[PDB]
Design a protein around this ligand. Sequence first.
Ligand code: A1APA
Ligand code: A1APA
Ligand code: HEM
Ligand code: HEM
Lengths: 439, 439
Amino acid sequence: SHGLFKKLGIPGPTPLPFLGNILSYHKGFCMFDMECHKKYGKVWGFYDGQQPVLAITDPDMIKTVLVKECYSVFTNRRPFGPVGFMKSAISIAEDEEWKRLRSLLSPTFTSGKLKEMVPIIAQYGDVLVRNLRREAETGKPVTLKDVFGAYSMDVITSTSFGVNIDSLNNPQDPFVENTKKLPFFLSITVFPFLIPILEVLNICVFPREVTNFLRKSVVDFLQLMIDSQHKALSDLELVAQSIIFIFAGYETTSSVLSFIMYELATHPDVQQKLQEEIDAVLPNKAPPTYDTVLQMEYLDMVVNETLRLFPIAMRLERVCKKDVEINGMFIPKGVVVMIPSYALHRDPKYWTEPEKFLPERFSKKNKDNIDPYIYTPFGSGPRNCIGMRFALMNMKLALIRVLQNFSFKPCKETQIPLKLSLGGLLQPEKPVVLKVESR
Amino acid sequence: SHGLFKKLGIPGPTPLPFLGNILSYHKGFCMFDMECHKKYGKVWGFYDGQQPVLAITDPDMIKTVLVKECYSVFTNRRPFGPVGFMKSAISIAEDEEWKRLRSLLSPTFTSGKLKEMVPIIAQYGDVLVRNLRREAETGKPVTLKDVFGAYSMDVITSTSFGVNIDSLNNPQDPFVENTKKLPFFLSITVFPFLIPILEVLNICVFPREVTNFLRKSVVDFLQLMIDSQHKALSDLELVAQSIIFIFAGYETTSSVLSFIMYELATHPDVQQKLQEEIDAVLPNKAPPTYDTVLQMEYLDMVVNETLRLFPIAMRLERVCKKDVEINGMFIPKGVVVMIPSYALHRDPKYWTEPEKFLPERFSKKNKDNIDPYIYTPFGSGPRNCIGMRFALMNMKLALIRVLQNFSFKPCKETQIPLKLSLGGLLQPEKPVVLKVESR
Ligand SMILES: CC(C)c1nc(CN(C)C(=O)N[C@@H](CCN2CCOCC2)C(=O)N[C@H](CC[C@H](Cc2ccccc2)NC(=O)OCc2cncs2)Cc2ccccc2)cs1
Ligand SMILES: CC(C)c1nc(CN(C)C(=O)N[C@@H](CCN2CCOCC2)C(=O)N[C@H](CC[C@H](Cc2ccccc2)NC(=O)OCc2cncs2)Cc2ccccc2)cs1
Ligand code: HEM
Ligand code: HEM
């Protein structure tokens, strides 16, 4: 298959037998995407082992793939190794199975249901401040990843199961043992023929401890999914969607929050301007609500600029169902089409000083000079992030309460400039540690 | 997956882990189909390893699968182990790739093109008689499988490539060496996860000698396929369809002819009545033509009754693309639906004395008391045997010339009653040997 892109006339790095271009991932596939963008242009191809992958950076062509030709050609993502029963998760399901799960789960992420989840998940803001109050009296740096990981865990557990744990001060609740389990993954691309082997060996990507407990354990997601019971639902599928929410509500929410605090501490001018906006909207540590969170323009600008610098999905991907000719280029069946979000967010073409953290990019004035198909932190089209608004509301409620009571400064232990780990996840190379003061 | 049919309420034999019901194939899957039909009824399910297979015998439900719901749900067959480039063969291709190959190849099997192929393939009838004249003067039994295999090989080679070999008296032509290559196949069902392994090991089901020669070697099929050059064609695909024709034109044609002669020798009353019909239509060894072959009613009755007793495909199969409820029964996605042709052809319900060779079943009178979805020797629907009329014309031209000059009687070496081999192909357990006289 290594002669497909040279047959179609698409430029790209020459692949090695069996491996393809995977050795070029040694610097991280984000840097690989940037270098390929810099020397090839709007379109290039490469091989994850034997799998051809076509990268596209044209906004019109990206809209055609993510939106216009979604249900017909670009419906599904590229599958991974052993999935087990998680094949019924919405982010993994395909074609009409995904369409069914999308319809059953879409009302669960309504603005109305989100407005009902605000008074519940705000109670853990009072918990996060106290969990941050005690660790701030030490006078020594704090690992936000844990204090945020605790808060984020408290949210998914409460607004999906009513399990009101204090995850930090309770490493004992039966709903914290299993959640605690949320080199190999690269041997899948050289050996894609091994996936059917692991699907009969039942080696899932998780321990047997996790899924067996949640299967029995099976306003909140669990209710609203049982409330709305292609049209049909099942028992094991209910656990699959629950697992998909927990990883998202934990790893993504806490990672972005840690990224935001690093930018707020290393840019204290932005931090005060945010604290002053929060004070003018919520006088003297006033409790935030749904209606008042949407009122903070500069808070929305800070979150958007962090997600530009650190788009935790890095890439969007779709599998070509059939043959197609999109915006003047032929794409054969089986090719994975990929949108390099990280590279596009840092493209010197569309961005002035892309490496700079400049929240004013997303002010009401310039926000219009932003192509929604270059800046895609939540994807786009019928299969974008279904929990975008919940994620934005969750992180902002955390930032308001944390900044209403505390200020954040760097340390000798803080990694400046921050470097990104060269793994499969977009996260800091070393944990973000910051000096925490109070007011 | 072994709990699917008991969940849907469908009866069937209890499967063993890993194996499913494959041990029940020890008596041949034809007998397994008959026994399951006798004790379960219209519908039953079983497992080829982990693969659920649903058998159906209702004519209305069979028409729904083979015809009415073909393009939407039941488009493709059940794939096998390593296919290599043969995935582009029409009998193996899927969905829109098959639809494209079906359109490009359908005019090649037109009655008009067949009428043009008659004067060419009839010249080998003059060759078959001479190849049967010399072996008949021995006074010792003959193996029709070889004399027919020679004739059949001469036909595909001439009416697809103009390669006018005398395959019997020329084991030297470069077009006979490769064609000569036309336990393991059961290890595929217990280990379906090994197919992706063999697709990268490139171990095809053929030697490397065969495909490499035909790829370079690449009225007749080759012309008409290049003449008509989704709409597009390719080089390696041209060889794939050529290989699919050669196996069909050889193994099926000679096997049925051997089955016909066994029935004609063991029923000499049918043999004389056929010889008298041929004489009244073609006076004194007259040369047969297209228009005069269709004029022999009793010849058509003999061929149809042999194909009833020995339907060489044995089973028709379709893969369920989605979920469906057909003629009052729900079929989930992934289930292979199977029509047991051999069992239905010998069902005491629709057939009086099914084990008897009675050509009068297909007389113009009773031919109407025959459900076309119980008697399916060439399948039915958009994916039936595309070469049905060529196969019927080819075998009949062989029978006319062979019976215009010879008569056939059994021997001490003849296996009476004939037993079928318990392999994967429908062929005699031991070769059909018959005494050959002349006139
Ligand atoms: C190694 C390198 C060459 C890479 N190869 C890729 C290919 N590649 C885009 C993925 O498929 N990588 C997977 C991660 C696992 N590997 C490793 C790389 O090879 C095989 C696939 C990925 O993470 N994909 C998700 C699938 C589900 C994941 C994690 C998970 C797994 C099992 C059970 C539960 C969760 N997350 C998830 O449940 O979504 C929640 C979120 C919502 N919002 C942000 S996350 C599909 C997905 C879903 C949403 C957003 C993005 C992606 C990348 S780097
Ligand atoms: C062992 C037992 C449990 C069985 N499991 C099946 C499943 N099963 C219905 C098939 O798929 N078995 C294959 C035979 C190979 N195995 C063995 C069983 O497991 C895996 C599949 C079969 O023969 N299928 C054909 C595929 C192509 C074949 C032979 C061939 C293979 C490679 C290159 C070229 C030819 N023939 C063919 O090219 O067609 C020409 C004809 C036209 N007219 C009569 S033949 C699909 C097909 C096409 C036409 C008619 C019927 C079927 C059965 S018994
Ligand atoms: C900062 C937080 C988050 C970010 C940046 C993010 C980003 C993304 C992105 C880029 C995609 C892929 C969109 C595409 O391929 O077009 C995605 C998919 C998805 N996300 Fe998120 N996500 C976040 C949090 C969440 C949360 C909290 C949930 C649920 C509680 C969630 C649920 C999903 C699901 C289910 C999908 C797959 C949708 C489908 O396949 O139909 N995500 N997310
Ligand atoms: C006595 C001779 C033959 C018999 C009994 C026979 C029987 C069959 C049967 C039962 C099928 C499956 C139909 C279905 O699944 O609905 C089939 C398919 C097929 N046959 Fe034949 N066949 C014969 C000879 C031939 C010949 C001579 C050719 C070509 C030269 C041929 C080409 C094909 C093809 C291409 C298919 C697959 C069609 C598709 O998938 O679109 N067959 N045959």
